[PDB]
Amino acid sequence: TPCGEGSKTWDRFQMRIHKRLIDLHSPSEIVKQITSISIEPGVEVEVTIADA
Amino acid sequence: AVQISKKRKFVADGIFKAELNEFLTRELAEDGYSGVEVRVTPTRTEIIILATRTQNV
Amino acid sequence: PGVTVKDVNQQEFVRALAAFLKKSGKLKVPEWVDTVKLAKHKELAPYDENWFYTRAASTARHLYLRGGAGVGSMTKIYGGRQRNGVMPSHFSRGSKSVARRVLQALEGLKMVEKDQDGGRKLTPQGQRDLDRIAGQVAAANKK
Amino acid sequence: MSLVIPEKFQHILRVLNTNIDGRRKIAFAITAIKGVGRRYAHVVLRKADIDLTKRAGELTEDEVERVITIMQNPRQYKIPDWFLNRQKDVKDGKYSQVLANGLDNKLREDLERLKKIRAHRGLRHFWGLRVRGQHTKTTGRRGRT
Amino acid sequence: RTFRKFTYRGVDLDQLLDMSYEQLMQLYSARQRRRLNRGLRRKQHSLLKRLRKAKKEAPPMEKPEVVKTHLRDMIILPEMVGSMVGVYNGKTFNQVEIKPEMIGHYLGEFSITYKPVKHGRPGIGAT
Amino acid sequence: KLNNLVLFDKATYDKLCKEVPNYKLITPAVVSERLKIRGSLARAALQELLSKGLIKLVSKHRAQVIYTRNTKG
Amino acid sequence: GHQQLYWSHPRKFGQGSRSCRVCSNRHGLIRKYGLNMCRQCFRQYAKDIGFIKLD
RNA sequence: CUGCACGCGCGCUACACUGACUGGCUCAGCGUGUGCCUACCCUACGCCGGCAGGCGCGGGUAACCCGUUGAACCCCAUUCGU
Ligand SMILES: [Mg+2]
Hints:
This is part of a larger assembly, with seven protein chains of seven kinds.
Chain B: H1 6-10, H2 12-27, E1 36-39, E2 46-49
Antiparallel strand pairs in B: 1-2
Chain D: H1 26-29, H2 40-48, H3 61-72, H4 101-117, H5 120-126
Helix pairs in contact in D: 2-3, 4-5
Chain G: E1 29-30, E2 37-38, H1 39-49
Antiparallel strand pairs in G: 1-2
Chain C binds one RNA strand through residues 9-12, 14-15, 32, 35-40, 42-48, 51, 54-55, 58, 62, 65-66, 69-73, 76-77, 79-81, 83-91, 95-98, 100, 114, 117-120.
């Protein structure tokens, strides 16, 4: 409610965020041509630093 | 410097989107605005406008 | 036969080991032991006069089960329920400087040493003789 | 171990200025003295080395006179300093436990102190009002008319 | 001859003024010791300058004229025993004669922020 | 139920030592309303009558200690 | 004016320095997850942030 | 905005022995954590204090660290007895 009047109601918003993970033994040069095959605006992909 | 937690990652680049969707509502109201859509990369990012009358903007 | 500490009633194992550390009079007991109150959520001293021996027996038996605990972890396992008078009750942390001294009282008894990372395990001299009197109190279940 | 009763048993004791019960046990019998509470009693007795499972009328006069001495001045029996009432008192700087009409001596003396210099706490003792910053719109009604 | 009754923590006022700030923390209670372990700030010092100046400019064997202040957070230090401050209650300046027993209180103690209620009669409310 | 006493007189210690092992449900609440003793002697004296051997223990729970008469035949 | 004591009261800790990032309210804001919006602004933009109610 | 001769509304703690103390012994789930403005986050371990707490040394932007979240009730013994 935008004020104090009403009948003590509550709305419950939630946002489920998902996370997955994959290892590779790959060279760090061909990682980009696996990176440049999707546009897919609703994801967030990150590549681990190569020093391991 | 450093980046922040994945919980406050996603509300940040949603409240990014909620902010400029309000501004471009206020600006492009005279042009048949009908929303936006964003793509963020670690490069050149692109905000495509879904305006109808594109000759006015 | 081959009896460990796990297969014995442990509420009376702590009674047995308390008399063990008593009659092996080497446990350095602190001197403020009669004005103590033990972890402020409770309002009297312990009813037993030598409560420090049974608290030594207790923190030995727990540290058999949970290798690598410190003085903060001991205060959590001995803390309890604070009554706030007219306000609702809550959990409370234990008392740090009775848990710290009792872990120091057994490290000078050659029963508990520090680990590579933080915490404390028991030395092999520790687990050899509380398994030894675990079997003796399991035999005292028969004797 | 007291398998019948002994030939002597105090029906009342007479310790500082108050007659205390004989049927309580000493750890809870001497809590009748104002200033010796439920927690202060047990520390006095463990300096006196008395058996705690004993009732009040089953101490001799020698055991009582040692318990009287310890609760009177507890500092030289090595009872520490923040166990006491008058820690760092506002006239002497001494550490003491007060146990008597001396308790209510030093109670009104601090109330009449504030009423002498007219602090805000002293005016709320002069009225019948709540002192430690409570509310008054809804509570404490029968402390007034 | 020249004797009254006084001492405060076992320390009398003639040996409280030649006494450093450090061992006034040790004698004060825990809140005022924390207040003096933390700093005294600029306007807390600018009032004591007027308190020192009013003692010197006072006519001899006569109480000084008032210094008006708003700040009612001041620890009453032994340096201004016998002074005359006027401490603000929100509306007016109440004229408070500092005397050697209030030497551990705030200035807000001695200037009530409300007039104390007296009486009335119930009108339409209370059913 | 009021003015109950502690530390047995002779007139209730000759009465405890004679007839209290006779009956069948001896319990510290029972000797608080039939004997005028108030309990914590009903635990204390009845602990040492089991140490004698005039009665038998049955339960020994922390909330209800139950004794009985001892087998005579 | 007189720059030393114009805005001198310390807006720091406390609800003098918190503000709704949309239109500067200070009442009932949501400081969780770095939203920093108020009670009312959040229900406007909750679909745009990415929060769905239940379905 | 808390001022109190009073009235009323949501609550919290109780009036006890189906308990209260003291000591033992033993099990959780949801979730949250260092910030653009923004100063302040969650904390293990080690040592000082009797407690509140105080310093050292780390870890964690988190199924990685707090944490195998040793939660209370309850359980088992002790004391108290209308
Ligand atoms: Mg009852």
